Design a protein. Structure first.
Length: 337
C-alpha cells in the first residue's frame, strides 16, 4: 500500500497516494468531484475523480459499482478508461471512498464550440472519433443515453474521448422516443445525439433547444416530420398516440435546405442519423463507413469490445453487498502496464 496524504479542496477532503501531486479542482464530473493532477510515476497529467457519497443508499452503492465496472472494462482510444483506482481504506469495513484516475484531456466539446467556428475537416475528425468510440461501447451492449458536448472530452490535439457512458440542457440532445417515455429504445438513441451534436458543430447553434419535454418533441417533429404510418403502428401507448396524432401533421423537411451551405456529404449523414423512426437510423458501425469519413475510416482500426457482463443490473442486493463487490473490483484492478 502506497503512502497517502490528506488535504482540503473546496469543502471536499482528498486523501490520495503521494504519487499524485498538485491537485487542482477543474469541475463536476457527474456525481463526483474532479481534480487535475500530476502523476509522478508516469509523468502524465491526470484527472482524479472522487465519488460523492458512494454508499449513501442502495442506488448510490449500485451506481458506484456500475461506474467502476464500466471504467474497468473500457479500453479504447475514444472512451474514458482507467489508469488507476484507489481508496485510502486498509480494509473492507473501513472502505467508504472511491477515487478513479484517467488521462487528463482538459476541455469538452462546448469549450470548442462557443465563439469558435470549426472547419468541415474538424467536424469530420470529431464526429469520426465519437462514432469510433460508440461502435466500441455499443458492441459491449452498452448504451450511453446521455451524449452531449459536455460529456465529450477533447485535448489540445483535438483527440476525443467519451465520458460518463452507461451511467447546456441535457434534453437538447435526447432522442424523441425518450421524450415520449418509450422503454424499449435501442442503441440508436446515441446516434440521434451524435446527429444533434454534428449539426451544432456545423451551424454554431443548438439544433433543438427545447424548454421542456413537450417543447423538445415539438421542435424535433418540425424538422423530421410527425410520425408516418409505419412508425405510428409501433406506438403501444394510447396516451402517446392521442398526443402525437392530435398534433398538426408536419412533413419531414429537406435538410439540404435546412443546412444550406454545409458539405453535402455531411447533410447526407445527418439525414441518416436523424431519421425519426429509430429502427431506420444508421448504426455507429455503418456511420463509420459513410463517405463523409473517407479520410479517416479504417475497418481494421475500429475495434469492438470484449463481452461485458451486465447481469448485475437485474439484481437487488443490500448496500453492504454492493460495497463488498466494489471493494473486490478495486483490489483486482490491474493498470495498463
Ligand atoms: C471535460 C473537462 C473540461 C475541462 C477540464 C480542465 O482541466 N479545465 C479547467 C476547468 O474547465 C477538464 C475536463 N475533464 C473532466 N473530467 C475528466 O475525467 C473525469 C474522470 C472520469 C473517469 C475517471 F476514472 C477519472 C476521472 F477523473 C477529464 Cl479526463 C477531463 O479532461
Ligand atoms: F412522437 C414520436 C413518436 C414515435 C417516436 C419514435 C421514434 N423511434 N421510435 C419511436 C417509438 C415510440 C414509441 N413506441 C415505439 C416507437 C418518437 C416520437
Amino acid at each position: 500500500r502506497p503512502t497517502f496524504y490528506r488535504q482540503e479542496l473546496n469543502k471536499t477532503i482528498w486523501e490520495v497516494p503521494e504519487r499524485y501531486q498538485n491537485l487542482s479542482p477543474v469541475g463536476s464530473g457527474a456525481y463526483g468531484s474532479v481534480c487535475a493532477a500530476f502523476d509522478t510515476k508516469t509523468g502524465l497529467r491526470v484527472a482524479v475523480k472522487k465519488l460523492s457519497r458512494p454508499f449513501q443508499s442502495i442506488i448510490h452503492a449500485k451506481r458506484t459499482y456500475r461506474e467502476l465496472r464500466l471504467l474497468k472494462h473500457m479500453k479504447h482510444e475514444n472512451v474514458i478508461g482507467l489508469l488507476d483506482v484507489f481508496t485510502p481504506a486498509r480494509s473492507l469495513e473501513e472502505f467508504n471512498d472511491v477515487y478513479l484516475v484517467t488521462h487528463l484531456m482538459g476541455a469538452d466539446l462546448n469549450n470548442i464550440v462557443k465563439c469558435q467556428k470549426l472547419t468541415d475537416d474538424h467536424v469530420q475528425f470529431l464526429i469520426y472519433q465519437i462514432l469510433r468510440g460508440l461502435k466500441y461501447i455499443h458492441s459491449a451492449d452498452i448504451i450511453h443515453r446521455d451524449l452531449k458536448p459536455s460529456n465529450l472530452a477533447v485535448n489540445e490535439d483535438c483527440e476525443l474521448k467519451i465520458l460518463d457512458f452507461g451511467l447546456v440542457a441535457t434534453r437538447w440532445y435526447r432522442a424523441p422516443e425518450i421524450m415520449l417515455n418509450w422503454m424499449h429504445y435501442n442503441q440508436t438513441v446515441d446516434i440521434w445525439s451524435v446527429g444533434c451534436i454534428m449539426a451544432e458543430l456545423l451551424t454554431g447553434r443548438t439544433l433543438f433547444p427545447g424548454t421542456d419535454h413537450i417543447d423538445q418533441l415539438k421542435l424535433i417533429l418540425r424538422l423530421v416530420g410527425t410520425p408516418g404510418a409505419e412508425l405510428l403502428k409501433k406506438i403501444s401507448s394510447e396516451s402517446a398516440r392521442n398526443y402525437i396524432q392530435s398534433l398538426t401533421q408536419m412533413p419531414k423537411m429537406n435538410f439540404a435546405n435546412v443546412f444550406i451551405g454545409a458539405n453535402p456529404l455531411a447533410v447526407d449523414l445527418l439525414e441518416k442519423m436523424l431519421v425519426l423512426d429509430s429502427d431506420k437510423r444508421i448504426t455507429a458501425a455503418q456511420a463509420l463507413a459513410h463517405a463523409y469519413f473517407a479520410q479517416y475510416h479504417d475497418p481494421d482500426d475500429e475495434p469492438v469490445a470484449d463481452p461485458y457482463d451486465q447481469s448485475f443490473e437485474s439484481r437487488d442486493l443490500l448496500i453492504d453487498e454492493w460495497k463488498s463487490l466494489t471493494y473486490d473490483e478495486v483490489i483486482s484492478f490491474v493498470p495498463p502496464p
